[model samples]
Target chain A: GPLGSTIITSLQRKEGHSLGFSITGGFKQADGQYSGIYISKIAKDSIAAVDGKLSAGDILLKINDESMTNVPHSRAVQMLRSEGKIITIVASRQQ
Target chain B: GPLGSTIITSLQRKEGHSLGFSITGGFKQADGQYSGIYISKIAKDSIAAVDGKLSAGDILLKINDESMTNVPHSRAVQMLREGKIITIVASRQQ
Candidate 1:
């Protein structure tokens, strides 16, 4: 919900960027405080392009072991951009 | 080097828009990984409009004091746009 969580829109980019999604339908977010991340839907086949190591129905928990599972989405994007490198995001496959 | 990098273009906007950056240099990632968040430079005297709390070159380790240490750029942009608010950021000093 928009109450206390991050919600991403796919229409950010012009073309080739899906206005639908970029991840699977299910994703994970861990926060002993805010605790619990929810991703309603995902883009089409963005997993294969992101990394062959990920798949659909997978609950994304961490990126390179960082607790982005519950971090603010904008901050996450900043981190990824700031990283200036490729990151291996971990997801819980079909849980 | 374009080999292993995440270069961001400044012209992400159009007219009435400036291609200049908006952050300072010398940031910290504290990753024990490929750290060294070199910011290169800051925009101008246009940051005093952020928050009356944060100054430049403060080593933004965590948003709410979390460990953003070495995330990524694009991902961060995606995160903030969700929060639905104008942000207050800092940069390195001269």
Candidate 2:
């Protein structure tokens, strides 16, 4: 287990808009194993890309105060969607 | 608005297993309106497929009595993940 260094950042989205990033992984595997969720894609000129703190391969550790550890992919996506204008994300990036 | 006939069905998933269906739609359009969630895919030999009640293209209306109306796609997926056994209400085009 390569526990990477943790980085926390906040990004704000305008009213009725997405955070402008895509997430992947964090699904339960066939062997009943769970993986961590990662930032899959960042939209150009979007809040996440402009913020310049989050990266595509960063492992999402939490959103706001909710822990993302062992969360299912769908659940993680829901958590991200549920947040309001401001989203404080905690992520881990490998050194 | 062509509201189709409503169909209600129940499907059960074993512990540590998924309900075995993929969902699509229910996202907010550029016009600021949300579309209905639909069954995009049904896995073979999965609980949803073996049940033979849920089908691809069925518009999911509710899950376990929780209304799916205007819900976001991610929220809809989370709702479907909630219960091991769930009662789903859906509609299909005529």
Candidate 3:
């Protein structure tokens, strides 16, 4: 069983590194307008796997403590791909 | 790292059981209008995990000997959810 706590993890991809994962998300507006962004897949033997901090169902909830649950898909993507190689991410467990 | 071979796997769920995975895909016209459908995420400890045949990025190439790679997203989804039990062929190499 791969159980984990909802702890914030800092992921940094330096100039020579990459995000090491693929993300696939879109807008969902059932109860409220929000974007559902998640780590779609982790690359084999990539930095993401080496870091062991991210997973497939981990929802990208915040970037640098800025909430992204209610943001638009484009805006949330903008923040995730914004300046600074060092990025802080808050992930929510998929239930 | 997890490595797998390209093999046809038949997955089935009973009347009360679930499909045990979530799929998210859309149509892309970069090269053609083929709808790209893949196993986006596998539910933790679900039947999919138990089956061990399906995984994230496993492209659903065909269902019941019917090609789905070029079909519309809705149509392909309809086929995937169309039966009591299921037969499938997937490609993780794609």
Candidate 4:
């Protein structure tokens, strides 16, 4: 099968609530450096799921136009959490 | 320069002592799975460093022929620790 492609979308957060997704990865690779933060999970009926674009297993390429590449896991999480009311995300999904 | 290459070697553990290296990054990837356990640090004058082969940033491929691919970070650590005088297959950049 062919490899999957990238997805770029934005999600808005409701007042006093989260974007409702979780993430993982953003670690080093065999090439010997840190790379790639991934979307690990999405809550049902939440902002991310309701937006209908984000999914678990998507490689997050950017958050709000900021590069997510070569970043550590903790930093990725922090960026996502602090993105404020609206977030523009760029991600890649595998086939 | 070229991207790099792989290095496969072994280090023997001294009785009652550690192999003298630490690892990181057996976490999930953008591809959506765990992968590539790495040698994050190697202590100077330790078994791994003295062996003159293993180094920090090498991708640990196997321990005693047990594949390290697609494993969680904790599991990778446990495998390396329990091998107890074993062969290690790894990769590195040029």
Q: Return the top candidate by TM-score.
A: 4
Ranking by TM-score: 4, 2, 3, 1
Distance from true location, Cα of B68 in model 4, Å: 30
lDDT for position B80 in model 3: 68
User: Native contacts retained by model 1, as a fraction?
Assistant: 0.00
How would you encode candidate 4's per-residue C-alpha lDDT over A1-95 as one tens digit per residue? 11334466788889977888887766666756455567778899798898887788776656886766556778888888887888988665544
Off by over 4 Å in 2: A1-3, A30-33, B1-94
TM-score of each: 0.28, 0.47, 0.43, 0.48
Model 4, span B5-81: residue lDDT tens: 44556777788678888887665657565645678788897888888778787766567867665567888777776
Best-to-worst order by lDDT is 2, 4, 3, 1
The weakest ten consecutive residues by lDDT in model 1 chain B span: B1-10
Q: How big an interface RMSD has model 4?
A: 13.9
- The candidate that wins on DockQ is 4
Model 2 agreement with the true structure over B18-77: per-residue lDDT tens digits: 788888776674535355667888889788888887788776757886766456788888
| Cα displacement (Å) at residue B87, model 4 | 33
**Prediction 1 global C-alpha lDDT:** 0.31
lDDT of 3 by residue, A2-88 (tens): 211243567767676677776655355453444456667888777677778778766554578666444666876677677477777
DockQ of each: 0.02, 0.02, 0.02, 0.02
Instruction: Give the lowest summed-lDDT range of ten residues in model 3 chain A.
Output: A1-10
Which 10 successive residues of model 2 chain B have the least lDDT summed? B1-10
* Prediction-by-prediction clash tally: 26, 0, 0, 1
